[PDB]
Structure 1
Amino acid sequence: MQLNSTEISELIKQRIAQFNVVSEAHNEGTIVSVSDGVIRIHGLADAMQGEMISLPGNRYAIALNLERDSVGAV
């Protein structure tokens, strides 16, 4: 909304116009973007790097390293 933190108030009520949005999952999430089994990783943001992670249908998806936003993984 208006001026101080009303900006954030009805940016939470302007947000809250939209506010269904902001959120994230850890782990959960999703493989953000992928080709050939290397994926930008969505959700699961903060996690032990290189934690082989139960992977699609099976595997422990091997966490490659933290590219903070969308981790790549093996």
Structure 2
Amino acid sequence: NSTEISELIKQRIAQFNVVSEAHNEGTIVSVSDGVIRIHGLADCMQGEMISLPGNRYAIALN
């Protein structure tokens, strides 16, 4: 069952359409005192400029 298990997982995940971000994209998950935590951005690089809605920028530090 070891392999048909993984196949059934991939099948059912595609079915219920849980999905991962694009690599150049993410979503804000917290906001506080001037700092935001973003989830995703697999290809953000330290010091990069992230563009927010409303034509504003955030600087990736952590």
**TM-score (ref. length: structure 2):** 0.62
Question: Judging changes above 3 Å, is the alpha-carbon distance between structure 1 residues 13 and 61 closer, same or farther for their aligned structure 2 residues?
Answer: closer
Query: What is the TM-score when the length of structure 1 is the normalising length?
Result: 0.55
Equivalent residues of 1:10, 1:16 under 8 A apart: no
Q: Whose helix proportion is higher, 1 or 2? A: 2
Structure 1 residue runs of 5 or longer lacking an equivalent are 66-74
Aligned residues of 2:44 and 2:60 also touching (Cα < 8 A): no
Structure 2 residue ranges without an equivalent (≥5): none
Q: Distance in 2 between matches of 1:37 and 1:11?
A: 44
Give % identity. 98
Q: Which 4+ stretches in 1 moved above 6 angstroms?
A: none
